Structures are given as structure tokens and as C-alpha cells.
Amino acid sequence: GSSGSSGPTPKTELVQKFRVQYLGMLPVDRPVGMDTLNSAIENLMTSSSKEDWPSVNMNVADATVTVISEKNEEEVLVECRVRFLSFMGVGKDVHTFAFIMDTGNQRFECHVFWCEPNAANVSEAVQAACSGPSSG
């Protein structure tokens, strides 16, 4: 019986940020897969309502995707590190944007969102984050 762990903290930097909506969290099986993603968007879509989706703030830095509350700024919601991120795309509507993340164990969670108009900038700020088609 024993265990321990630790980690550093983030610093101050200019974040892109992206005001959007939060469809919610949908369970998945694999860390990747298109049918595994869409399924979520679809699930959440029907599951919850459009108005139900609360407003959040998708923080997108060098390579980090965090979901901080719209109102509060020091209230993280979901920390999706571009490093941890596995898969990410859209459903039937480009206005949507979901992504799979590995919290810890093999368990994988997907977080969908409702961007406006489309999720070009969002997915972009994410796609580019991951690494993008060579930026430098």
C-alpha cells in the first residue's frame, strides 16, 4: 500500500480562446474512429437539447485545448492536451466539433461542441495545435 505523484503548473500566455457551446460528454470505446466520434455528436445531439448546450470557452494555445467556463475564467471544465488528444473531427454538421481524450486509463472521453457558424476555426485552432501541416 503506497503511491505518489506530482506535476508542474501552467504559466501566463496569450491564448486563442474560442467561444462555443458544450454538447456534453459522450462515452466511447476506442481512442479513435470516425463512427466512434459521430456517434457521440449524434448521441449528444438527440440526447440533450440545443439550448441545453451551455456556453463555454475553448482555450487553444500552442498545443493545448482547455474548456473554461464562459462566465468564470479561472474555472476549468475540460483539459484536452493536444498531446493527450487522440482523435477529433465533426459530425454531420461542420457547426459541430468533437474530440476524444484519454483521461488516464484506457478510458476515453469525447467532448462535442457547437461552433458558429462552422467549426472551421475551432477545428483549425485544434488541428493546427496538434501540429498542423507544417506551420514554421
Binding site: 481512442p31 479513435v32 470516425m34 466520434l37 493536444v82 498531446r83 493527450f84 488528444l85 487522440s86 482523435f87 477529433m88 473531427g89 465533426v90 459530425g91 454531420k92 461542420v94 484519454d102 462552422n118 467549426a119 472551421a120 477545428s123 483549425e124 488541428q127 496538434c130 501540429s131
Partner: protein, 32 residues
């Protein structure tokens, strides 16, 4: 055949092809 929107592509691409983070490095199974 004219060229469609550039951005749309980025989307339409994901809508299907999607996107797989390499950095992740999913033990076993080497993506083609």
C-alpha cells in the same frame, strides 16, 4: 472542375477522413 472552398475542405475532410493525432502514439497498430 472548379476548385471548391479551401476552408470547407478542412472541414469536409474531418467530417470524413477526420483526424488522428500522431503524437498520441497508440501502443501497437502502426497507422498506414
Amino acid at each position: 472542375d472548379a476548385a471548391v472552398t479551401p476552408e470547407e475542405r478542412h472541414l469536409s475532410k474531418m467530417q470524413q477522413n477526420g483526424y488522428e493525432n500522431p503524437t498520441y502514439k497508440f501502443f501497437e497498430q502502426m497507422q498506414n
